[PDB]
Symmetry: C5
């Protein structure tokens, strides 16, 4: 994830232009190899046309260039790129929206599951560890960085996400499918055992716990779905064919012809086709947006920081269910205890953001007395 949110907080002078001086997650980093290949091919074709062809062959090449340049069209490539990249970006944000966060569940575990003794603490930690274990089980299946961190389930044992007993239990339950769903059944059965043991006082709290757990299950199932059901290969190949055919025909039709032949539109030899190169940067960077976002769980600069998410979820969940269980700050009267209209102060740097309330768009509508009286019937 490359974050530049602070750099674009305001629409200042050339705010998006300052983003062009970036390297991580940039157009250049994703495009330099393709651009160098295009450069080499274009200049090889140029040198062949200049110093490697006869006069008749050069005339034939000029006819070919004039024919190719008339078939270079911006409409199909722009249309398919816009629609395909919109689909890719929508799926990318949907994939982020299904990344599981155990915060609601950990709040309910810290609240509902009672007992400051060792058994209740162990129960809360085991429930939240089941949640985190299911999350990491799906993330090591969908994310290459998490898989590199945990190449096997024994790595999850060494990393504290799974106990040897849980590892053996998962080995007993081995079916020829992905077993990320097992910790959810473990969570349901353990919560049932907690409610039957008196640790959960009411079954409505059990229902809330299992509702949050099932929401996490749905998110992980959607992550598995996005990992499994790719965007159809035919669509990706259509977009790739469009872009690459466009620039293959630019590899010939955008060649600068001999200015001594007085060709229409080729009277000037600039050597470097800067407009073709700008089109290359724009179009192949538009393609690279999809090429980077199509699997947001890889190892690109703009890919999701899934290992950080796993670590943060584990730490925060364990702290919430273990150290923060019934550990409250002292409940004391606040600053606005007997002040019916609290007015928190503003700093000197924020005094300009003190704004009057918007009372609705109809507040300033002016009406005279005659038209404000209620008409009978």
């Amino acid at each position: 994830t490359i974050t530049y949110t602070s750099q674009v907080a305001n629409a200042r002078l050339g705010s998006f232009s300052r983003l062009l001086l970036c390297w991580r997650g940039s157009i250049y980093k994703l495009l330099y190899g393709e651009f160098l290949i295009f450069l080499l091919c274009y200049y090889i074709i140029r040198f062949i046309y200049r110093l490697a062809l006869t006069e008749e062959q050069q005339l034939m090449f000029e006819k070919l260039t004039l024919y190719c340049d008339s078939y270079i069209q911006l409409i199909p490539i722009s249309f398919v790129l816009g629609f395909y990249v919109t689909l890719v970006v929508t799926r990318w944000w949907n994939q982020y929206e299904n990344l599981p966060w155990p915060d609601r569940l950990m709040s309910l575990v810290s609240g509902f599951v009672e007992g400051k003794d060792e058994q209740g603490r162990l129960l809360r930690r085991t429930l939240i560890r089941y949640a985190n274990l299911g999350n990491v089980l799906i993330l090591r299946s969908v994310s290459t960085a998490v898989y590199k961190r945990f190449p096997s389930a024994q790595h999850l044992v060494q990393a504290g996400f799974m106990t040897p007993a849980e590892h053996k239990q998962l080995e007993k339950l081995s079916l020829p499918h992905n077993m990320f769903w097992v910790p959810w059944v473990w969570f349901a059965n353990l919560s049932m055992k907690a409610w039957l043991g008196g640790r959960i006082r009411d079954p409505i709290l059990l229902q809330s716990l299992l509702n949050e757990m099932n929401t996490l299950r749905t998110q992980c199932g959607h992550l598995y779905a996005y990992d499994w059901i790719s965007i159809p290969l035919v669509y990706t190949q259509v977009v790739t064919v469009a872009v690459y055919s466009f620039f293959l025909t630019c590899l010939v039709g955008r060649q600068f012809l001999n200015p001594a032949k007085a060709y229409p539109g080729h009277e000037l030899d600039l050597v470097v086709p800067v407009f073709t190169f700008l089109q290359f940067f724009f179009y192949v960077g538009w393609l690279k947006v999809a090429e980077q976002l199509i699997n947001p769980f890889g190892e690109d600069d703009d890919d999701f920081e899934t290992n950080w998410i796993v670590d943060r979820n584990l730490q925060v969940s364990l702290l919430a269910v273990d150290e923060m269980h019934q550990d409250l700050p002292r409940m004391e009267p606040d600053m606005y205890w007997n002040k019916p209209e609290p007015q928190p102060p503003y700093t000197a740097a924020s005094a300009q953001f003190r704004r009057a309330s918007f009372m609705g768009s109809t507040f300033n509508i002016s009406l005279n007395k005659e038209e404000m009286e209620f008409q009978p019937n």
Copy 2:
């Protein structure tokens, strides 16, 4: 389903270009017959123009070609293809989103329904089998592969999805509609009987079970809706007419005219119209995206693997409600038992993904002392 998610994890050099060397679910596999027909028609017209027409007829054909080539427009076909294919892809992902997964329901069945004896085990298995039976009943109605697997309900009896008693009960309840909804009523009545029999301890657990069951019912009803209410035939015919008229007029207007006549734009005879063929690949592959995704439950390469889904759901549901009922791994203190900030290790292959936390975009905003003081009033 053709999965290439691992191949596009990173935006590497020509990552989408390596996808062009695929055959299953590719442009070529979906396009070779149409392209061969187009090739044959184009070259037959070419040979008729060359060696089967008089001089006046050839001049008339040249006039016709010049007239047809001026009416070849990229705007309508690209517009209608973009919007129609966007609709098709949206409906395709919606159809996947309504494929039923019994994991939440099977967790609730494994937890709520009590009893390690034969009767409670039979009750849990029968409930989860009702869920899977309803799912397979709608899937054999919407999917051609599932229907080929189960041409009749007696095949479902031989496959263990339905007992002979359930088959006879469904035969008694025969109405002149699709009877996929029956197992949901069976599930509701059986869960009510379980709650009245003491197997379900509280009616809130019954409510949760029936909520998950009704969610599965809504998903199956949406699958039936997508199978019944197709995209309107007029829209599909509009897109088909656009594409096929475009290439019917390319069948004549893209013919290479006689270079001895010195026609503008036809001074070169390349024999093979590679740009027309690239346009054909692009546009008819864009059409084939819709032609493949319009019914994602058929037997295409990119169609859903519904038989695998049915088998996996049956196996996982039966294992969850039967073998995993109150079968928990030993609850033991974890690795981070008394470690308030757990730090799971990273492998050498994943040490570069250890990242500092993003504390918000306002964290690096610099303010001096004077503008940080709270102003009075």
Copy 3:
């Protein structure tokens, strides 16, 4: 509803081309009158230009045709058609998504409301009849076919959807608005009376019943909203003006001028403007998509089969709450009773769809021993 889902299960050779040989819900059925009017007007203008004008008048007509043909633009019509038809299709599928289905509610009524005697059976039937009566009350207000079936509420009395007592009660409660909401209040009060009478054992079941009832109420209210708040007339008129002005200027600018005058682009007289006719079919069929889907409750071929939905809902609801109440198939051990990994068989026609499981995209990532070891700290 015209269903061709089985015909487009696979992306076969010309699968969308075979849909062009259809008549119901086709382009031709929705377009033949407009196309005949366009044909007659075009050929009348042609005959006026040929055999009804002087030489100077013919020259003036040729100038007018050359001026009109330069203002025939594809961009505005395609843009507005794409966006407007996308809006129409989205609203059409939203209107289908709000068609009420009582299956969840009927499952909850069959389960929760107890009593195999006459009173409990009457109670269940009356509740589900209130649901179906509200559905049919909104559908006879939004659908022309349902209104033709039930022109008055007395027709609903003769059709069994309403009793004479309910008809008199609705006549007492007559307000100058649509009274489709009344059966929902009836359902709520009857369910409260059932819970107070002991027929509903717990108020949580009452809450579930009323939640499903309120979901049906929201769907019917959305149907009323879509019937009331049309797409704004200005937008529809904008699209209509665009299309009809395009073809009014094609009625003159696409006329074949005299070939003896040697006009650029008019050197050939084809008599029949096949490309203008293909554009007419495409564009006015794109318009007809919106013209058919804008009110999906009318009597078009692709309009919703609302009368069938009403009949199916009534039959299925009455069967579910009356005959299927606590009427369960015998609960017996299944085929996979002691088989921990069930494997249902495949037919010879479906053996090719037996697929291995997708274990995640990271499953085939290769790592050596050195980079798989956990690094310290």
Copy 4:
């Protein structure tokens, strides 16, 4: 709201053409002033060019017209209009979707709150009046018609939406913000008092009541949000600048030049530029779609009928909670009491809509005996 849903029930011959003969909510009603201004400016410029310029000045004007006509582009205006109007229409339908309807809440109030005496009736009426008061408080803030109906809260007192006691209570609770949220807190506290007083028998009914109340609160908050956070002014100004610059350059570049000068494309003087006027109607009507829908709570023809909604909600809510509380029609056996497959009759006008059921798209798949047998293993 202009409703033409009945006029577009079928895709008949020129169904959208018959909508062009409308005046309320039409293109002409929203466009006549702008079109007359454009007409006057165009003909003033025409008369200046004809009878108010010297020969050299006329030649300079002709050069200016030829220069302006080459910069008249349809692409930017169509793109920005399509995207902006799509945003406006989406926000308009979202604003309708957040218009509060108290029907679910009034059903729950009529059911849950018990007592046919004066106190329970007063309690139900006060709860539903709190709901309607909150709705009208937000609607008089977002809608100009509702504000004209109730310029002050004392008008709400005279209109029965608020009692003098509630008006005084709201005056006591005066904060410098919009106080539409107060009746929701009133509803919550009154429902709590009702449950503690025995009028609400179970707290689950209290939860359902407050859930419906909070849904209404969310809808009203979204209405306030749409009233407050407008579409950004820069986007609206971009679209306005595009359209108005397009027609300002059409005001000169679309002038008919002198035909005696033999200008290319200006050899004919039609006086009235009908194609420029059609473009004006189309584009400025596309703009007027956004200009009318951007605030759907104003006083346009297609704006929401908010006063009718308020009146209908008040009447229906009071009738539902007061007269329909435990007032049920007599529960009697229906027409299909012992008829397991009910078949309601069809009228002669609706007999053609009797359709066979769609049993799924796989129902007609033909398989022979050999390929239907289950293969072993």
Copy 5:
């Protein structure tokens, strides 16, 4: 936030034209620096071409200008701007939709948590203060104005959002991540303590409270997600490159060439390229829409008024849970006590908005007696 909703209530004569006379949040305010830079560069290039080049150099510059003007294309920039700005606007409204509002939660806190004594009042205030503290903790992380108001947590202590005890408790729980989630765990544990202490009478009320709290948690987590996961930098750079390359090539190709050379399209020297400047305003304002909305929590004119939201939420929440707890207006019979069809009056200014009810689109369908009779069978 710049609100002009009242100015666009009606589609009046030039309603969007009157918005062009605005300065705050306008095109000019966001564009004047870029436009002045473009103006200076264009006129510097103009003066170099006029008074700083030789005749051969001027001819070369004319060739360069003719070459650059043929590569100025509107299609890619318009496509990428439309799609990118649509994405930005969608994300901007999603970010507003996840701004937390404690109104539902404060209603439930005012209702459920009992006790008019000091302890219950302190409990309600502490719960609602936990909600507001979590909201302000995420808003000071995502919003620059809120961070300027509260540069540190000690500023939150001085502003009454946090007590010194809560500040010390948060300092004890310090993990190397953002600690905005802590008040949600505090809320859950405090609500559990309230229910165990008898302040919350039933656990269903506890479930409702924690459901509203978890909804607020999800909204704040989505705000954190939008702050962290920016739109990918490659897409922003693609759009920026497109726009800036378009206007860099307009900086040369739109120069007015020497009219004495008689160049096609350059026969007139207008000095000021008003059409290029209109294109600049339109396109760079379209870009500025995204440049302003990409981070809606900055300090732009159209950015969200987050400090006002924080203050309003604090005041309204404290008033609702403290002063409005069981403080109800006197429950008295209303104006329509025994009036079954209430008719609130209309003012003279609103009498035209009194409209008859829409009874459905099928209400005016005419049928004769013969076709209204039910057909047998």
